[PDB]
Symmetry: C4
Subunit: 388 residues, 4 copies
């Protein structure tokens, strides 16, 4: 009925409780589960759902052969009920394409899918399940966006896009949408040197995005957006607790306004919640591959170039595969504060498990507790050998 | 609540963006997907859906053997959520039969299915999911209709039917329905010499249908209908850019009031949007078979017998199978103009791929953009060899 | 909102048009379709659905072995969307048991299932999807009811039950329900000598049921019920056009108040519409087995012991299996009269096709037209050999 | 709209009628049915549903190997339509974990899942499908709860938890929730010496729970809770009709305030309805294993240490497997009294049927009748050999 406004601050994060888990690959071993990757979670005022890019085949289907590839005509943004698997029979298609974002503004949902060949991609912006706006590639090199939910304030839903090189300077733009229409866009500003796959959350009328510097940075760039003034800035997380992957070993002092060097041309989508002493960072446990996942409480990580962990929680053991992770919150829960949440994509199959011809994932997701809860670990749980 | 009125003109068509794609044959390789053909798309005020004639079997089922045949007791008009595949578990049956049309008048949906043996077929007209009117065969030779959506204006939904020869003069009638009841019908008038499978759209209180002259014409007949006066006329697209299939090579000058010769007794359902300089024609790229699909901007194609393309867009490469194509619009979108849309049926299996015993299709669909968007191609994507 | 009242007469029946067909056995060859038998159709004010007794297994499942048996703990009344098949994933369970009826009174649905061993069965009467009343066996011999929809008038929904011998005198009772509670019951009166499986319809405040005399009659008993006075009478169809199965050949004169002899201890559920000159009878074409199905217009069949057909329609060829048939109408359609409808169960498998270990059916259903429509035939369409 | 209040007494229980049965294992032999255990039933004001702990795999799936284990990261509370099976495509996930309860307070549903390793488990309390409260393990030994529905009165929904030894003293707490928040909790009081898996029901503003003393008792402990004062007491069922399993043979005199000895360190979840002369107890027929199930009318069982059966009903024969059983009622049915209901879990597979590698169940459920209804027995019905 009214546009949602970001009027609350973050709740105190003292631990993470289990929120949703779909066990998709385990169940998909013998049921009609779509192959996916690049999942996320997003809430409407009455329902929270799982989202992902389908590969337009089931995991047991012969067409799963080749699904390591990221961009094909057979991909689509799909959504499905929380903690169910993305099946053929219960998945709703939001739009067609191989890069996406989606968010509800309090009245209805905007969803964005990019499709096309590398040199001629375009974004279609859907609002209230109708296409409204289209945006053509500006740099003719894989126009691409967040792969997790956007955030809205009073109708204004900013979205970060990047078009251009994955291994050198690219052209990043912030579009400010309302009802699916472009109110304004700006080129990237501040000191972030490369931006991909922003993970965003909203509190007290401000939107914070933690992104992936694929080119040089093992610290993560951060964009902070004012959705009333429609202006932004960017920097890196200052902390020596480095949160991309792959990455070098943690130093004692990080970098605020430049990429922390050591790994070039690679990375993973990730997120953080940056809120003074209430600051938690996600990362893979391995510095080498997408294995393991932990949350670390790192007070003032954004602004303190020597901040180190004061607390932590294991999400996925380093003997289990992880993948993309990102932020969402239920902006429509009752209560005085917004409860931080996140998901981790648990990638199975290629390239690490190459006895199968497919790549897919399942999802685990947690939200914060003000309790100090006991931890478990949350692996995908499938036995690859069953698929041989 | 009120009947919809065609009060808008067409938006400017500067390119086509991806709208929906179900990847049915790829997914159907290992999931319970119904065999179909003759698909289309149609919008209600709150939802747009895929439609097709089911063959009353799954593609992996042994009963798919023989589904090259067009008319059996096991066919039905089914609909299903946009870009999902037509599965056993998510397909809604509209009515029983082997030829159909369907359209929403703003209050509720009329759907029409024809069934019966060739010499004794009948149409049942459903309105608000109840049968209301029945129409018996008048020429005792395969009573048949549009195979794509009809259009309504103030409750009046005209529908084109043909009964009689596919290879000689036949009896074409235009019925004017309201709430499922016959207000009036007229025999075909104007200069179109044979009519099948009209693809219709509505703008500024007028309904334009592009049809298939199966008997002699490689140019397409056009019926223009006034749904207030309930009168119509017909002619052919004047343009030398010939849009049936199979067809001869394009000439320099077309024919306005007669079939353009060169191919007899064959054709394919197709469509155009005819709007002065804003005129786009669809066709197969091959002149010989249902391969490839392109959109061509052909200014004043309807009225200019020498008009040639000023712009174009590839939809399906000539190394991929196409099939039937037709028009629909979301008459209930917000905004100042109606956004032209279309689908292309991507036929797989027999007769061209005869190593399988079945015939089926999947669907791709696009709508117009006022941007000049980059193009991709959109094949079915299934590997027939997986089905061997 | 209000109880429905039977305030209309029957429409003129000049032919039958196709209404619904689920092709369940064809589709069930390779999808998760439940084994059923004893199907029917029943309308709510907003929706008409298919109903049947499930056998609590799929047709391809190993537990379909043995489903020739009528009464087990694994049966339930299920319903599902019109013309879809009864699948595991789309079938709604109404209640548990192996004999049923169901009807909507304009406010909500009453459904009745009987379960139990032969000597200790009981009916549970559900209303608004809650159990309300229970009725214990009175004759300790397979308490059983209509296997097709009941009819309501001003809240009053009479239902016919029989308890006792299938091959001799039994105890038949008519219960008058309102909101699931017993207002009254009466023992069978009039001249019908044995009653099973009544097929009912309602017009002008009167409910007519055509039933099965399993003991002696090849003519069908008829119960006429006044749902305001809650009284009834019974007789047989007088016509020599005999409509049970198996049966002797048709005579020239039938019997009004006694069973027409020639076949003992056997029969099939069937129906008629008895409305003066507007009278149509259903029967199997074979006098020997459940093969073929036709509708015959037999003016004054109920009251004229020499009435013969003046018109007819083939529904199922005598080279195709039929089965149970029964009546329903959409009491909530718009218009001045009620449109007669019926279904025919198309039984496949045992005992006639004993190369499979299962028994199941699919459904075909038609409603009357005031047109003289062309006829087709409507077989199940499955190839038993595919199931070997 | 308003919180439900327990304002009715129990209806007179003269027998039990069949309520729901899903036949899950029979159907699951060839369809995508999830492996479960620990099922129950719970009503909302408009719908009653089946609930269970999923094992995050189908029964035919290779991941069903190992599902004898109770606690894994792949378990979740799921619900699904009454008498349908828990399939991949129709099961709704309530929350993630391996121990649960759920109840509707008249406005919305509270659901509670516990997850974690044995020494660090936590409960998450969901209300209106959002997480609201979290409770950390207090005794670091498998925090666990009812495995059947809780009961609410005026918003207050008490829940029994136990943390600590299964074979010695443990710490049992009663939490009083409202809108998902903790109003109060108390440590267990009264004379019950060990509490697990309480089966609860509500009448005349009082909640009665029959539980499992795993440590020493073959009589069942009972907790009676006042949800207005938020206080409780506990004792055992006094009756010599002993209702745990395994158990010694029935004596002539039971124990009111102590465990009846004979079996240590084992038991099964069960229930009773304790209402003076209207008192019925459930138990397994075997004293040795979870085989058979009967209901016994035992007047004043709670308070009379010599009470013996005056009536009974067989639910499951002693030649069929049973399992957990528990109580629920439809608090929103019309009428002057609440109708007692219960379910029995029918466990199949390991450890008793060890030719399969899985453990699963199906469900049967009954409600009371004021009639003296004939009895049937209600086995799972699957043939284990089909799964070999
Ligand atoms: C039941 O559940 C409980 C709740 O989960 C669980 O208790 C939790 O236990 C976990 C696991 O131990 C704790 O997480 C750790 O937290 C560490 C920080 O806390 C320490 O440091 C603080 C600041 O000085 C102290 O305040 C704090 O003390 C207080 O709390 C204590 C409770 O544990 C209590 O006993 C104390 O007396 C006191 O009150 C405490 O001493 C955190 O540092 C640690 O993370 C590091 O270690 C992990 C390896 O285990 C790494 O995976 C992680 O990445 C961090 O180390 C890496 O990075 C650092 C920063 O750069 C580097 O310095 C390190 O060298 C290391 O770097 C290497 O590895 C990297 C990752 O691979 C790589 O990138 C680098 O390049 C390099 O190779 C962990 O998060 C959690 O906080 C506890 N929670 C609570 C509320 O207590 C309990 O155990 C369970 N109970 C049972 C019975 O099972
Ligand atoms: C990224 O995305 C971009 C957007 O899609 C894409 O750019 C697009 O490129 C396509 C593919 O080239 C363009 O489509 C073509 O459009 C042609 C018409 O445009 C020409 O002619 C105009 C009129 O004289 C000129 O105004 C126009 O110039 C302007 O625009 C230019 C941009 O391309 C610019 O460079 C110019 O300087 C200027 O500003 C331009 O010169 C259209 O004619 C063509 O269709 C024909 O060709 C296809 C074969 O390629 C056939 O499949 C098609 O059927 C048409 O040819 C057939 O039919 C004609 C009519 O009868 C016959 O004359 C021909 O002989 C031929 O007939 C044979 O074949 C038939 C079909 O099989 C058969 O039936 C016959 O019997 C016979 O055998 C095509 O549609 C598109 O317009 C561009 N869109 C835009 C906005 O620019 C860009 O390339 C992508 N970028 C990258 C980097 O990949
Ligand atoms: C396109 O669609 C059209 C619409 O469906 C279709 O036309 C229809 O054609 C069917 C099939 O022929 C017609 O059904 C038949 O109707 C017969 C009754 O009509 C006749 O009798 C009337 C009364 O005297 C005449 O008024 C009537 O004449 C009028 O209409 C004519 C149109 O056909 C027109 O030409 C005339 O000039 C005139 O205006 C007409 O003469 C009906 O009797 C018949 O049923 C019997 O026959 C079937 C065998 O074909 C049996 O299966 C059926 O059971 C009936 O016969 C059995 O039972 C009788 C009663 O006891 C016995 O007397 C018989 O001996 C026989 O009994 C044996 O078999 C039993 C069943 O197995 C068994 O139980 C017994 O023991 C014994 O063994 C049939 O229903 C239909 O009415 C036409 N509809 C219309 C509107 O015209 C048209 O053909 C299709 N067009 C094309 C081009 O394909
Ligand atoms: C059609 O449907 C009808 C409705 O279901 C069905 O009739 C029902 O029949 C069942 C099965 O017989 C009845 O259930 C039994 O009820 C017994 C109690 O009723 C008796 O005792 C009363 C009190 O003295 C008498 O009032 C009562 O008489 C009245 O009713 C009669 C109707 O049957 C009528 O004929 C009379 O004239 C009169 O009006 C009647 O005499 C109940 O005791 C019995 O339960 C015990 O027996 C079962 C074994 O069959 C055990 O499984 C069960 O556990 C109970 O025995 C065990 O426990 C007792 C208590 O400790 C011990 O004393 C026993 O020794 C025994 O203990 C062993 O076994 C235990 C379990 O394994 C073990 O734990 C122990 O350690 C030890 O090893 C049973 O519930 C039902 O009440 C009838 N219902 C009605 C309304 O009539 C009818 O038969 C069907 N009709 C047809 C035609 O099929
Ligand atoms: C899931 C998994 O086995 N992760 C291990 C981790 O347990 C660990 F052994 C590791 F060496 C690592 O990268 O930390 O190697 C991973 C595999 C490797 O980095 C890419 O092949
Ligand atoms: C899909 C496909 O292969 N189309 C080719 C086109 O690529 C092309 F090669 C063609 F020759 C054509 O008709 O244009 O032949 C088609 C096949 C043929 O016309 C019928 O067999
Ligand atoms: C379906 C079918 O084949 N019906 C034929 C009918 O075509 C016919 F040949 C018949 F002889 C008949 O009963 O009319 O026999 C049926 C089979 C038989 O009565 C029982 O086996
Ligand atoms: C289902 C079943 O066979 N139950 C029988 C009962 O029929 C019975 F024979 C029994 F001995 C019993 O425990 O009563 O043994 C059960 C199996 C045993 O207790 C554990 O293996
Ligand atoms: C939480 C848990 O492990 N519950 C299991 C249950 O899954 C189930 F497996 C079970 C059982 O079947 O007996 O026992 C309980 C635990 C007992 O109550 C002893 O404390
Ligand atoms: Ca990087
Ligand atoms: Ca032609
Ligand atoms: Ca008979
Ligand atoms: Ca015990």
């Amino acid at each position: 009925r009214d546009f949602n406004n970001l009027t609350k601050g973050l709740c105190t994060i003292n631990s993470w409780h289990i929120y949703g888990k779909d066990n998709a690959v385990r169940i998909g071993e013998d049921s009609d589960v779509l192959v996916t990757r690049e999942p996320y979670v997003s809430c409407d005022p009455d329902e929270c759902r799982f989202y992902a890019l389908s590969q337009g085949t089931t995991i047991r289907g012969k067409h799963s052969n080749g699904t390591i590839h990221d961009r094909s005509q057979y991909r689509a943004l799909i959504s499905w009920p929380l903690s169910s698997p993305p099946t053929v029979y219960n998945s709703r298609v939001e739009c067609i394409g191989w890069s996406s974002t989606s968010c509800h503004d309090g009245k209805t949902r905007m969803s964005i899918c990019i499709s096309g060949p590398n040199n001629n991609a375009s974004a279609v912006i859907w609002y209230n399940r109708r296409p409204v706006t289209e945006i053509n590639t500006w740099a003719r090199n894989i126009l691409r966006t967040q792969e997790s939910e956007c955030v809205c304030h009073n109708g204004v839903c900013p979205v970060v896009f990047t078009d251009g090189s994955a291994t050198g300077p690219a052209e990043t733009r912030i579009y400010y949408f309302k009802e699916g229409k472009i109110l304004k866009w700006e080129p990237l500003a501040g000191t972030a040197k490369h931006i991909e796959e922003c993970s965003c959350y909203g509190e007290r009328a401000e939107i914070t995005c933690t992104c992936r510097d694929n080119w040089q940075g093992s610290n993560r760039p951060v964009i902070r957006i004012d959705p009333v003034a429609m202006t932004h800035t960017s920097q890196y997380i200052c902390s020596p607790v480095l949160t991309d992957n792959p990455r070098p070993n943690d130093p004692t002092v990080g970098k605020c306004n430049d990429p922390y060097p050591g790994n070039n041309n690679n990375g993973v989508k990730g997120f953080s919640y940056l809120d003074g002493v209430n600051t938690w960072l996600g990362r893979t446990i391995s510095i080498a591959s997408r294995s393991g996942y932990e949350m670390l409480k790192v007070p003032n990580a954004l602004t303190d170039d020597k901040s180190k962990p004061t607390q932590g929680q294991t999400i996925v053991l380093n003997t289990d595969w992880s993948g993309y992770s990102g932020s969402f919150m239920d902006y429509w829960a009752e209560g005085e504060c917004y409860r931080a949440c996140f998901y981790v994509e648990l990638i199975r199959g290629r390239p690490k498990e190459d006895k199968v011809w497919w790549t897919s994932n399942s999802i685990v997701s947690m939200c914060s507790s003000t309790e100090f809860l006991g931890q478990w670990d949350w692996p995908d749980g499938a036995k690859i050998e069953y698929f041989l």
